[PDB]
Structure formats: structure tokens, C-alpha cells
């Protein structure tokens, strides 16, 4: 709730979505959510989760393959502010290949091609019926997504 997103040990970028708000995406070795769950019970939590998911897919023009692969993820809600944390399993090349068809991998792809992090590397390529999948490796342990403003985008929000 107090640590900085724009820390030197982190790779960060902020994107605008609308209604004078956006998303702050952080690649960090510091965790923000400690429960291993993501409620999504009521439609409000689901709508706010879908709104953030579709914003990243539309903005980054992503196409996530279906490899039946799962990226460990927990979410939290504090009012209208959503927090999504991915516990990244992309340390090695085989780790990236076993987690290639996930949204977090697609975000690592976006961080790589626009050079928002010099740690990410294209470690594996997987052919399929869709576009050739690129699996990216990174030493970062966590990928954090938060709905915040341009004024406060360098500071983590309190979930
Ligand atoms: C992610 O990692 C944090 C810190 O190690 C842990 O508290 C949390 O339960 C983990 N979440 C999932 C979904 O594994
Ligand atoms: C972020 O929260 C505001 C309310 O504070 C809401 O109006 C906006 O739709 C949210 N943005 C996203 C992408 O969820
Ligand atoms: C994060 O932790 C991993 C685990 O050893 C390490 O390899 C990596 O260098 C760390 N990244 C940063 C930015 O400290
Ligand atoms: C949600 O985020 C907005 C924008 O960062 C902030 O103004 C508001 O106080 C937050 N809600 C809380 C902290 O309950």
C-alpha cells in the first residue's frame, strides 16, 4: 500500500484506458496479494475484472493461445480499484514454455517489444493453429496490475 511501483528494482509502465484512469503494470520481486484466491463472486467484481482484462488485450492487440496452461493469479478489490497479481513462473526457458498460453506471457511480450524491461528474453517458440507463440522468460517473480490515476501511478495502491 506504501511501496513504490516505479522503484529501480522494478520494471513499470502505465497505459490510459478512459474515464481519466488507466492501468499501472509492474514487474517486481515484491508481492502485493498474499491470499491464493480471486473471489469474482458478484458481477461487480467480475465486470471490473473483465474491464481490466479486455483493456490490456485491446490496447496491446494480444491473442492468447489455448494451451490449457494456467498462470498462478490472485486478485483483490478495494472499492472500485482492482489489484491483479500474477505469480510468474517464467524463470527458465522451460518455465516459459509451460506458461506460454497465458495473459501474463502476453504482457511480458508487450514489455519486451517496447523495451519497458531489459530482463525479458524470447526463450521459446511454440507453433499452433494460430499465430506462432512466443514464450518469454524473466527473473521477476510477480506481475502486478492496478487501476490507478496518472497522478499516483508510481505508488502502489492499498488493497
Ligand atoms: C503468490 O505469492 C505470494 C507470495 O509468495 C503468496 O502469498 C500468494 O498466495 C501467491 N498466490 C498464488 C495464487 O499462488
Ligand atoms: C478504475 O476505477 C474507477 C473508479 O475509481 C472506474 O470508474 C474505472 O472504470 C476503473 N477502470 C478500470 C479499467 O477498471
Ligand atoms: C528476483 O528474484 C529472482 C530469484 O532469484 C532473481 O533471480 C532476480 O534477479 C530478482 N530480480 C530482481 C530485480 O531483484
Ligand atoms: C481508488 O483509486 C482512486 C484513484 O487512484 C482514489 O482516488 C480512491 O481514493 C481509491 N479508493 C480507495 C483508496 O478506497
TrEMBL record:
Glycosylated position list: 9, 19, 29, 39, 81, 87, 147
Source species, domain of life: Viruses
Disulfide bonds: 6-154, 38-75, 100-135
Family: Belongs to the arenaviridae GPC protein family.
Full protein name: Pre-glycoprotein polyprotein GP complex
Species of origin: Mammarenavirus loeiense
The encoding gene: GPC
Amino acid at each position: 500500500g506504501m511501496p513504490l511501483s516505479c522503484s529501480k528494482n522494478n520494471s513499470h509502465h502505465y497505459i490510459f484506458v478512459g474515464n481519466n484512469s488507466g492501468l499501472e503494470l509492474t514487474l517486481t520481486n515484491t508481492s502485493l496479494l498474499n491470499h491464493k484466491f480471486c473471489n469474482l463472486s458478484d458481477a461487480h467484481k467480475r465486470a471490473q475484472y473483465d474491464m481490466a482484462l479486455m483493456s490490456i488485450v485491446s490496447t496491446f492487440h494480444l491473442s492468447i493461445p489455448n494451451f490449457n496452461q494456467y498462470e498462478a493469479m490472485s486478485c483483490d478489490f478495494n472499492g472500485d480499484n482492482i489489484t491483479v497479481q500474477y505469480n510468474l513462473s517464467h524463470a527458465s526457458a522451460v518455465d516459459a514454455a509451460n506458461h506460454c498460453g497465458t495473459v501474463a506471457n502476453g504482457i511480458l511480450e508487450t514489455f519486451h517489444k517496447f523495451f519497458w524491461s531489459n530482463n525479458i528474453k524470447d526463450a521459446y517458440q511454440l507453433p499452433n493453429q494460430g499465430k506462432l507463440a512466443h514464450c518469454y522468460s524473466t527473473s521477476y517473480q510477480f506481475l502486478i496490475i492496478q487501476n490507478t490515476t496518472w497522478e499516483d501511478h508510481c505508488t502502489f495502491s492499498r488493497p
